[PDB]
C-alpha cells in the first residue's frame, strides 16, 4: 500500500506548490525597485579578540551586547568583553570537538555541544566562583550542530541525527522531540516571541516548528544543497538561510515561499553563517572564501565586504542593539566591526 | 570593581591559554576511519550514545590523540570538516573481504579528494593480512572476478622481502596496494602523501608504524614551512 500513499503525497505536494504559485503576485524586487538604495558600506575592524588556539566554530552575543561567548575546536569556551577585549571566563570542555555555543538570555548559563552528542550546560554565576557543568543533556544519536536557550530552564538543540529536541534542564530530559527532517539538521533560529523556531538540514529544506505543540508547522524547499546557517528576521515573519550552493535565500512564514536569492556569479563558495542587522535591512553572511559579505536584504545588492579574515569565517553575529558585528573564523581570531 | 583588576584577570587567563598552547602543539591528533568489517576496533585495543571515542598513547615520549568515531549517522560529509588541520588520517581496510574491498576504494577516493582534507596525509592500514593469505592459498575466491585488471597485473621487480610467503600471496597483496596508490596519485596533488602498510590482527608494530609515518608527515610540513622545497 506504499504506492498509493506515495501518489497521495505527490498530489499533496503538487497542491502545496499550486497554492504557493497562486499566492505569488509580485516579487520583493518588484516592490523595492522604487526605493532608495543603501550605498557602499565600509565597516572597520574595531576590535580583534585573540587567544583561541584552534579554529573557532561558533560564537554568540549576550543580551547586554557587550559579552560574547566563543567556541573553539581545541576544547575551550571563552567569554569576551567586547568593549575592552578582556577575557571574562575560560571554560575547558570535556570534548574538544565542540561545534556550537549558546548564551542564555539572562547571562547566567552558557551551553555548548559537538561530536559527543551531549549538550553541556555551564553555570557562570556560582557561589564557588568558578564555572562548572550544571547539566549534560544526553539522548541524541548524532553530533550537535546548534543549540539556543529559551530561558534558564529550556533549551532547543539541533543534532546530526536528523532530530531537534526541546529539553528541560533540571530534569535533563527531552520534553519535546521534532522528527520531521531527513538529513542532518545544521542550524536553528528562535523567533523573537520564542513560540517558534526554524531549522536548516542537509536535505536542502527548512522547517518551521511549534515549541509547545511539537509539530512541523511549515516547510521551505528553496535551496539545492545543505543548509549551513539560518537566522530570523527581526519582526519574526521572515527568515534567511545560508547553504552550500553559494546562495542565500529569504523565506517568509506567511507567504510560505521564497522572496529573494542573494547570490553572485563571482562567489562559488558555500555560506557558513548568516545574520541580520537591527533594522533587518542588512544581511551579513560568512563564506568559505575567507571574507564576509554585506547584502541589501530588500535590493539583493552587495553593500560591502568584510575582508579581514585569513581563513574560513565560520560564525558571525550582530548585537542585540545592532551596534556591532562579531565574526569568527578558522584562523582562530574574532573580529568586531562597526 | 576597578577595570584595572579586570585587565589583570584577563592577563591571568592568557597565561593559562599559553601554557595550554604548549600541550596542543606538542600533541599529535589522529582520526581513525574504517568500516565495521575492518579491524578498526582491534587496532584501538592494541594501543596503550557517545558520539566520539578518544584513545591516548605514547611512542618515544610523543603524545598521540586518536579519535575513533562512533554513534554517528552513515553520512559524514559534515562532521568530517571538524577533522581539518589534523596530523594524519588512519584508514583501515579489510583486505580479505573482496566483495566490500571495492566500496573501501570509493571511501578512500572521497576522503582523499575532500576539499577540507586536501592537506592531510593518510596512513593506510590494510588489516587482516593473515586472513588474506588464507583466502588466496585456498583459491576458493579470486580477485579477478571483481577486478578484471588483475589478470594483466604482474608483481614489480622489488616487492615483499618477507622471511617467507607464497608467491601468489605477494601478487595479491600488492594489487590491493596498487588500487590505493593510483587513487592517492591520480586523484591528488603533492600536498599530502598516502602511507600504505600491511597489518595483522595481533600486531605490536602498529604503534611504531604510526610514529614513523607521522614523523614523515611533519617533516614535509617543516620543509614547506621553512621554504625548503
Amino acid at each position, epitope marked *: 500500500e506504499l504506492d498509493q500513499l506515495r501518489q497521495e503525497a505527490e498530489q499533496l505536494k503538487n497542491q502545496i506548490r499550486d497554492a504557493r504559485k497562486a499566492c505569488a503576485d509580485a516579487t520583493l524586487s518588484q516592490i523595492t525597485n522604487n526605493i532608495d538604495p543603501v550605498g557602499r558600506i565600509q565597516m572597520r575592524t574595531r576590535r580583534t579578540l585573540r587567544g583561541h588556539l584552534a579554529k573557532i566554530y561558533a560564537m554568540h552575543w549576550g543580551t547586554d551586547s557587550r559579552l560574547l561567548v566563543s567556541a573553539s575546536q581545541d576544547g575551550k569556551l571563552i567569554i569576551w568583553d567586547s568593549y575592552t577585549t578582556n577575557k571574562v571566563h575560560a571554560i575547558p570542555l570535556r570534548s574538544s570537538w565542540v561545534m556550537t555555543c549558546a548564551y542564555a538570555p539572562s547571562g547566567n548559563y552558557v551551553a555548548c555541544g559537538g561530536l559527543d552528542n551531549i549538550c553541556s550546560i555551564y553555570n557562570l554565576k556560582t557561589r*564557588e*566562583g568558578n564555572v562548572r557543568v550544571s547539566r549534560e543533556l544526553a539522548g541524541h544519536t548524532g553530533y550537535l550542530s546548534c543549540c539556543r536557550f529559551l530561558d534558564d530552564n529550556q533549551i532547543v538543540t539541533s543534532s546530526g541525527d536528523t532530530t531537534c529536541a526541546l529539553w528541560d534542564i533540571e530534569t535533563g530530559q527531552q520534553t519535546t522531540t521534532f522528527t520531521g527532517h531527513t538529513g542532518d539538521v545544521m542550524s536553528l533560529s528562535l523567533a523573537p516571541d520564542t513560540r517558534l523556531f526554524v531549522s536548516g538540514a542537509c536535505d536542502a529544506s527548512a522547517k518551521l516548528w511549534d515549541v509547545r505543540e511539537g509539530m512541523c508547522r511549515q516547510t521551505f524547499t528553496g535551496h539545492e544543497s545543505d543548509i549551513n546557517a539560518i537566522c530570523f528576521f527581526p519582526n519574526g515573519n521572515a527568515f534567511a538561510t545560508g547553504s552550500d550552493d553559494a546562495t542565500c535565500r529569504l523565506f517568509d512564514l506567511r507567504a510560505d515561499q521564497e522572496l529573494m536569492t542573494y547570490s553572485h556569479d563571482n562567489i562559488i563558495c558555500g555560506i557558513t553563517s548568516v545574520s541580520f542587522s537591527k533594522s533587518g535591512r542588512l544581511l551579513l553572511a560568512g563564506y568559505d572564501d575567507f571574507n564576509c559579505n554585506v547584502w541589501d536584504a530588500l535590493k539583493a545588492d552587495r553593500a560591502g565586504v568584510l575582508a579581514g579574515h585569513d581563513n574560513r569565517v565560520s560564525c558571525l553575529g550582530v548585537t542585540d542593539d545592532g551596534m556591532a558585528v562579531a565574526t569568527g573564523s578558522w584562523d582562530s581570531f574574532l573580529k568586531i566591526w562597526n | *570593581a*576597578e577595570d584595572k*583588576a579586570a585587565v589583570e584577570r584577563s592577563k591571568m587567563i592568557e597565561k593559562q591559554l599559553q601554557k595550554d598552547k604548549q600541550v596542543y602543539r606538542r600533541t599529535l591528533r589522529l582520526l581513525l576511519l574504517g568500516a565495521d568489517n575492518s579491524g578498526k576496533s582491534t587496532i584501538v585495543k592494541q594501543m596503550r550514545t557517545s558520539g566520539i571515542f578518544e584513545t591516548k598513547f605514547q611512542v618515544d615520549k610523543v603524545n598521540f590523540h586518536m579519535f575513533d568515531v562512533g554513534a554517528q549517522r552513515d553520512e559524514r560529509r559534515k562532521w568530517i570538516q571538524c577533522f581539518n588541520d589534523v596530523t594524519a588520517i588512519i584508514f583501515v581496510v579489510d583486505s580479505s573481504d573482496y566483495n566490500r574491498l571495492q566500496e573501501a576504494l570509493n571511501d578512500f577516493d572521497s576522503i582523499w579528494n575532500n576539499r577540507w582534507l586536501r592537506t592531510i596525509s593518510v596512513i593506510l592500514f590494510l588489516n587482516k593480512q593473515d586472513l588474506l593469505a588464507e583466502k588466496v592459498l585456498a583459491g576458493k575466491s579470486k580477485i579477478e572476478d571483481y577486478f578484471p585488471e588483475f589478470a594483466r597485473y604482474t608483481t614489480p621487480e622489488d616487492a615483499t622481502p618477507e622471511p617467507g610467503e607464497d608467491p601468489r600471496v605477494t601478487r595479491a597483496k600488492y594489487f590491493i596496494r596498487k588500487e590505493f596508490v593510483d587513487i592517492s596519485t591520480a586523484s591528488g596533488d603533492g600536498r599530502h602523501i598516502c602511507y600504505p602498510h600491511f597489518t595483522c590482527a595481533v600486531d605490536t608494530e602498529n604503534a611504531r608504524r604510526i610514529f614513523n609515518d607521522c614523523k614523515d608527515i611533519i617533516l614535509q610540513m617543516n620543509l614547506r614551512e621553512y621554504n625548503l622545497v
Partner: single-chain antibody
Amino acid sequence: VQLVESGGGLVQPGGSRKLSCSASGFAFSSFGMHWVRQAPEKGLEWVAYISSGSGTIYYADTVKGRFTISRDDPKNTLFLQMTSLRSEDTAMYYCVRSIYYYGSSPFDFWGQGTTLTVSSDIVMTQATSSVPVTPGESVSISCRSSKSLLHSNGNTYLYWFLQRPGQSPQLLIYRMSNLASGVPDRFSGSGSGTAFTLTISRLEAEDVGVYYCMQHLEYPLTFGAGTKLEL
C-alpha cells in the same frame, strides 16, 4: 563558601603576629582578597589587598611598610604579617572575598572575624549615625563623597554593607545600583555622582544594624562612619 580565620590574642605594643584565613568551598585562587579592620564601637577601615595571582598588592597608608600580605593558593590560605603593632592597631580584622570581571560583585562574602588586642583619600561621609524606626516603615540612608564616584566608563563605584549585631558585614548593593545575591528586593540604592541614597521598603527584624558605605573608584578604599538602625 566559607572563610575561617585564625590568629589573635593579646600582643605587646612592640610585638608581631601573623593572621591567617582558611578558605573553603570556593575557588580561592580565582578571587582577590582584602583585609578589613573594625575598631571597637567604630566603623570599618580597609587594610590591604592581594589580587588573584599574588600580583597587584595594595596597602593602607597607616599600615604600609608595617604590614605585609601573603598568599598560598595550594592550601587556600591567606596570611597577613604585621611587623610593628601600635596601640591603635586593636580591632577585628575581617577577610573579604573579591572577584573582578565585567558584571562581577566584589566584596560579596566576608569572614567571621578575628580579634587582635594590643595593650588625597576620598572622604565618604554619612550624615546620620543613628536612625530609630519601627518595622514596616521605609527609611533612607544617605551618603556623600569628596569627588564624583561616577567614572568615565559609566559605572559609579559605591558599595553598601550591613553589619547585623554580632554578625560580619554583608554586601547589599554593589556599584550603587546592583542588588547583591541572597538579599531581598526591598533594599535599593540610588545617586547621581556624589550623593547616594540607600532605601529599604519594609523594615524588618533582620534589617537592624549599622549600614556602611564604601567606594572602589581608586585605592585606598574608604568606608563611612556608620549609620545604625534601631527599633
